Amino acid sequence: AMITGGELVVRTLIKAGVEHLFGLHGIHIDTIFQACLDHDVPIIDTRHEAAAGHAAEGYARAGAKLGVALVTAGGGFTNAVTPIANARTDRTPVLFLTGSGALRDDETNTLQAGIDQVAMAAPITKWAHRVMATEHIPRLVMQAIRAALSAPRGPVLLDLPWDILMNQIDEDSVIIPDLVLSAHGAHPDPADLDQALALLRKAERPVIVLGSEASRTARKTALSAFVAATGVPVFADYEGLSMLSGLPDAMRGGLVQNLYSFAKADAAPDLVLMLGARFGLNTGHGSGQLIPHSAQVIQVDPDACELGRLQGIALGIVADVGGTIEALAQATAQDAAWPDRGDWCAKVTDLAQERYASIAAKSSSEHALHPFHASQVIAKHVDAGVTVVADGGLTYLWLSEVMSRVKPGGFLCHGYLNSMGVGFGTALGAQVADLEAGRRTILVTGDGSVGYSIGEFDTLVRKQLPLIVIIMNNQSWGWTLHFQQLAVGPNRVTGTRLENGSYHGVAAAFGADGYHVDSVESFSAALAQALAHNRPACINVAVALDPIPPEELILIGMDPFAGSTENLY
């Protein structure tokens, strides 16, 4: 039979294992919506293309698989640009399918046409391309999927002109290729692997740090077997934290940020094995505050430019992170036993403890709910059956202090782009993936950031996605207000106050359950109750603004744990 170009798209996605799409309808892509309808492939349709974009990101990250976003020509594409950029930075594998104007109508000042969408996306994608012929669709879709999924993972843009999608062709005349692309990543040269293990055995206080590429491959069995065998404690940036959840307690270092205080306590690591973590925002750049200059660093990353980017390293390996973990588990399952490391792991715990307890002791909820105390209420409920997504500024910095000591099913935080607002879309897509794994999704966001995508409460009710949305409400763009006060002056605060709005009332108006709470008592009760029902909820938590999370000070070169501190201004 004759079939549309939109039909060729969907047949090809199906063959690649895609089971959900995220998008927002337009006539230019209707052929694709119609094919999905015929094939029972759900499309999670949102109220903003950005939210669809971020949802496909969230589905990808929470599910360790390909996310797919689908947007129409013109405004559709331009509204998807923030998700694309965020995926590029975060190394998230998303295929963005966009419509564009018909090639037949090129340069007619017509509806939604006239944007060079590929030129716009080229600098924020692994690959961006416009399809010139209907027969090409299946190979170019499959090619795009291979680009997205190979290491380092990333976003890909495929532009599908309206006429190219509406054109019909004989199904007997075009092949739909399979997805033939090894799931097992490339391993290191054995010589390099041996050299790494030689260094690791010789080392006195070694640590491992995991990045995004370790979550994408999700090689949990190999990882736990490798750590079980060597005894080495493991830390991670935010993307890598859920990979620590299946490790024996005594070797979970938690978030890499805890390494801060080690130098001051004469316990700086002398070896660091970086598995797909990068020198950048989460690892203290080239400063040495987390990853010491004096330490022998072994870095594994699929992108050779990332190796020793900001610091000298002892050994640099271009390989897949997953394949590397696998190879380490192999090499390690057969050789002599490894040195003890029990004393070193006890140290790591003890320091994570001191940090936590120092914050606990400093935090009061006497006059208003302290953000730390609010974050602790959430942690009580974080097991393997929960995915936590984090947005906001101060909100997530506070939340980060409770996360090292619990074992989340998933944990999705900001990446280098720090784009406020992305959390809602992200969490929605995470929740889609999580229903399939029987997990529950919780978004912890700030009163500012929730504003960006607050329409998606509609989408939760319509699609019966039981996401819980917790709003740490400090009546402000909090982090930026703090900058204004600290970096400029007491009364130079301007454009950062949000002294208005009933966010639970908004959610109620869209049909979600709305709670407003202001204390530890009331918040625990409300969260328990929302977790008990399989319904979407919004909990508006009134929270203090003044308190300064330690990571605020650290990310501008000040010691939050000393007595005094110089302001670099």
- Binding stretches for ligand TPP (CB under 6 A): 24-26, 72, 75-76, 79, 112, 392-395, 418-421, 446-449, 472, 474, 476-480
Region binding Mg ion by CB under 5 A among candidate stretches 225-233, 317-325, 413-421, 476-484? 476-484
Tell me how far, at minimum, the Cβ of 86 lies from Mg ion, in Å: 20
Q: Which does 188 bind (CB under 5 to 8 A by kind): its own copies, ligand TPP, Mg ion, none?
A: its own copies
Considering beta carbons, is residue 472 or 538 the nearer one to ligand TPP?
A: 472
Structure tokens given for 28: 């230019």
Considering beta carbons, is residue 24 or 223 the nearer one to ligand TPP?
A: 24
| CB-based burial, 240-256: b 16+ in 10 Å, e otherwise | bbbbbbebeeebbbbbb
159, 129 Cβ separation under 8 angstroms: yes
- Residues 206-245, mask of contacts with its own copies (x by CB under 8 A): ----------------------------------------
Please compute Rg for the chain using Cα positions: 24
**Which residues within the stretch 36-75 sit at the binding site for its own copies (CB under 8 A)?**
36-37, 43, 45, 47-48, 50, 74-75
Considering beta carbons, is residue 284 or 448 the nearer one to Mg ion?
A: 448
- Compute the distance between CA of residue 26 and CA of residue 521 in angstroms, rounded to an integer: 47
Q: How many residues bind Mg ion (CB under 5 A)?
A: 6
Judged by CB under 5 A, does residue 446 bind Mg ion? yes
Distances (CA, A) of 413 to 88, 118, 119, 391, 567: 15, 28, 29, 7, 28
- Residues 315-354, mask of contacts with its own copies (x by CB under 8 A): xxxxxx--x--x----------------------------
18, 44 Cβ separation under 8 angstroms: no
The angle formed by the CA atoms of residues 483, 360 and 470, to the nearest 5 degrees, is 65
Q: Which does 454 bind (CB under 5 to 8 A by kind): Mg ion, ligand TPP, its own copies, none?
A: its own copies
Considering beta carbons, is residue 382 or 469 the nearer one to its own copies?
A: 469
Nearest to 131 by CA among 108, 97, 180: 97
Listed as own residue / partner, the contacts of 307-315 with beta carbons closer than 8 Å and 24 or more positions apart are 308/279, 309/278, 309/279, 309/280, 310/279, 310/280, 310/285, 310/286, 311/279, 311/286, 314/199, 315/192, 315/195, 315/196, 315/199
Considering beta carbons, is residue 408 or 448 the nearer one to its own copies?
A: 448
253, 290 Cβ separation under 8 angstroms: no
Number of H helices, E strands in the chain: 22, 20
Judged by CB under 8 A, does residue 20 bind its own copies? no
**Cα of 561 vs its chain's centroid, Å:** 29
Q: Which does 425 bind (CB under 5 to 8 A by kind): its own copies, ligand TPP, Mg ion, none?
A: none
Q: Per the omega criterion (within 30 degrees of 0), is the bond before 152 cis?
A: yes
Name 134's Cβ contacts closer than 8 Å, sequence gap at least 6. 5, 8, 164, 165, 167, 169
The angle formed by the CA atoms of residues 50, 51 and 56, to the nearest 5 degrees, is 100
Name 369's Cβ contacts closer than 8 Å, sequence gap at least 6. 518, 519, 520, 523, 541, 542, 543, 544
Instruction: Choose, by CB under 8 A, the member of 185, 253, 392, 478 that binds its own copies.
Output: 185
Region binding its own copies by CB under 8 A among candidate stretches 202-210, 367-375, 427-435, 485-493? 485-493
Considering beta carbons, is residue 49 or 192 the nearer one to ligand TPP?
A: 49
Judged by CB under 8 A, does residue 438 bind its own copies? no
**Cα of 567 vs its chain's centroid, Å:** 32
- Residues 285-314, mask of contacts with its own copies (x by CB under 8 A): xx----------------xxx-xxxx-xxx
Q: Which does 525 bind (CB under 5 to 8 A by kind): ligand TPP, its own copies, Mg ion, none?
A: none
Region binding Mg ion by CB under 5 A among candidate stretches 21-29, 53-61, 79-87, 471-479? 471-479
404, 255 Cβ separation under 8 angstroms: yes
Instruction: Choose, by CB under 8 A, the member of 245, 501, 519, 524 that binds its own copies.
Output: 501
Judged by CB under 8 A, does residue 365 bind its own copies? no
Tell me how far, at minimum, the Cβ of 353 lies from its own copies, in Å: 29
Region binding its own copies by CB under 8 A among candidate stretches 118-126, 361-369, 405-413, 431-439? 118-126
Tell me how far, at minimum, the Cβ of 166 lies from ligand TPP, in Å: 16
520, 528 Cβ separation under 8 angstroms: no
Footprint on this chain of Mg ion (rule: CB under 5 A): 446-448, 474, 476, 478
